[PDB]
Scaffold this active site. Structure first.
Site, short mmCIF file in Angstrom:
data_model
loop_
_atom_site.label_atom_id
_atom_site.label_comp_id
_atom_site.label_asym_id
_atom_site.label_seq_id
_atom_site.Cartn_x
_atom_site.Cartn_y
_atom_site.Cartn_z
N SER A 222 0.85 -1.19 0.00
CA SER A 222 0.00 0.00 0.00
C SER A 222 0.89 1.25 0.00
O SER A 222 1.78 1.35 -0.85
CB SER A 222 -1.01 -0.09 1.14
OG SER A 222 -2.02 0.88 0.91
N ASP B 239 -9.17 -3.95 -6.09
CA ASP B 239 -8.67 -3.04 -5.06
C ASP B 239 -9.40 -1.70 -5.14
O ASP B 239 -9.42 -1.02 -6.19
CB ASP B 239 -7.19 -2.85 -5.30
CG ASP B 239 -6.43 -2.18 -4.18
OD1 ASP B 239 -7.03 -1.37 -3.41
OD2 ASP B 239 -5.23 -2.47 -4.04
N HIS C 43 -7.57 -5.07 -1.57
CA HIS C 43 -6.37 -4.38 -1.10
C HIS C 43 -5.67 -5.14 0.01
O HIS C 43 -4.45 -4.97 0.20
CB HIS C 43 -6.71 -2.96 -0.60
CG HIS C 43 -5.51 -2.09 -0.40
ND1 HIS C 43 -4.72 -1.65 -1.45
CD2 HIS C 43 -5.01 -1.54 0.71
CE1 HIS C 43 -3.76 -0.87 -0.98
NE2 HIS C 43 -3.93 -0.76 0.34
#
Lengths: 259, 257
Positions: free
Chosen positions: B127, B173, B205
């Site tokens: 991320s 995502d 995600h």
């Protein structure tokens, strides 16, 4: 492979060096990766190849804001490309790509391609264009010099830039305040191959947009030293300047050694 | 500077097992003993030298979100440092510097520095930590591999990254949508020295935060191929995978020469 006679304080501060300058316009309608521009170049094309520099304006700015660099630098034996961007609201990382696209145009396509040494290319830029110059140098370590003028960027850390970089700040800049832009940029740059920070005393964000002897002298010395490898100009850069009312701060990694 | 050949000649089976051939040990690094990052856990194998990789979490995340990579990768012959950040709300470019600080700690100061090859260092991250890994590679071209996992960054153009990079995206995502993060990052990367994009079918995600055979296989192959220069793992990467229900998209600059 150097141009011009041995420099003096007098020669490097004159509005024009020894070369006569021609200009050629590049239309926005004839190129795709940037907004066109004006190429300033030495009329004396019969000697050695010249180094080249592209120069970006800032946000809402056109090449008019940077036009004075054209004759001032080209007359010292450089090809100088004052570009326009695709739009005047382009951001720094887009300006970076436009600077690189403009150099590609200059060396591959332009009318002056065969007078340029394609191994000796630099970037300069004002404001967001100065942010752009830092990112252009980060992304192409073949670039041999960068001069970010009162630069602005949201990215603050340019430790990956391997290009000799002279950052010119304006002491009283409220648009790109040096404590938030120029200074963090400079401190992040590596010690080698060579960096400098020159802060213009009492100056505002628009100082780069009009003829400025201090900007000119140091930019000429920087491009000479790092695009041309012209060590006759080291004397202007190192040791750092002192006793100059135009300069409120200066930082360097002098001396700059050929490696 | 010779390449590594740690472990047996690989097979589909060997590279997909949760625990590879090396015994794994672990050491904690206190947050209070380092300044450039938030400490972490070093996972390392049981008379050679090993490549080393640091792994960053994402925004509001701690090393627990990345813990499974420690055994999974260290058991394949790597030193693996799952770091914490100084604060959990650190931004991507700060995470980049913390990844690099963590590597410097590993090689200069850590209790495992004697078994690390300082020439063979990589970064990974989830991320914002994956944004961090891209920036760390941009800023230190000596890094020999990067694996941004479902990466997020505001900077979109990584054309200056000179490190072999495998971006792992998640098809579904919504935090770092691939069309706005992983794909622009991948497309901007240069053709050489070598890049890949692996998109996990149907994934969210959070896919990188749980043991995932696809992530593991490709991450092991990438680190072997590029941190170790162990070309016995080329076969897993090139030609690109086909007929894999776990992979909804894949892009490469195979072959990697």
């Amino acid at each position: 492979k150097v141009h011009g006679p041995k420099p003096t304080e007098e020669s490097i501060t004159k509005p024009r060096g020894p070369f006569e300058v021609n200009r050629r316009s590049v239309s926005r309608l004839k190129v795709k990766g940037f907004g066109g521009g004006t190429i300033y170049y030495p009329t004396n094309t019969t000697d050695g190849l010249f180094s080249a520099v592209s120069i970006s304006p800032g946000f809402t700015g056109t090449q008019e804001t940077m036009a004075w660099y054209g004759p001032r630098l080209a007359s010292q034996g450089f090809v100088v490309f004052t570009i326009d961007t695709i739009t005047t609201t382009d951001q720094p990382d887009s300006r970076a790509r436009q600077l690189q696209a403009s150099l590609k145009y200059l060396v591959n396509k332009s009318k002056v391609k065969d007078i340029i040494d394609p191994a000796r290319l630099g970037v300069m830029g004002h404001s967001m264009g100065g942010g752009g110059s830092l990112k252009a140098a980060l992304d192409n370590p073949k670039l041999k010099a960068a001069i970010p003028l009162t630069p602005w960027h949201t990215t603050k850390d340019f430790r990956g830039v391997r290009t000799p970089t002279l950052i010119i700040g304006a002491q009283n800049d409220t648009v790109a305040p040096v404590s938030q832009h120029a200074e963090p940029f400079y401190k992040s740059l590596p010690d080698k191959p060579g960096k400098a920070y020159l802060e213009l005393a009492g100056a505002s964000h628009l100082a780069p947009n009009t003829d400025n002897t201090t900007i000119a002298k140091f930019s000429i010395a920087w491009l000479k030293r790092f695009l041309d490898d012209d060590t006759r100009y080291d004397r202007f850069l190192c040791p750092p300047p002192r006793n100059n009312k135009s300069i409120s701060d200066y930082r360097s990694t002098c001396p700059y050694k050929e490696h």
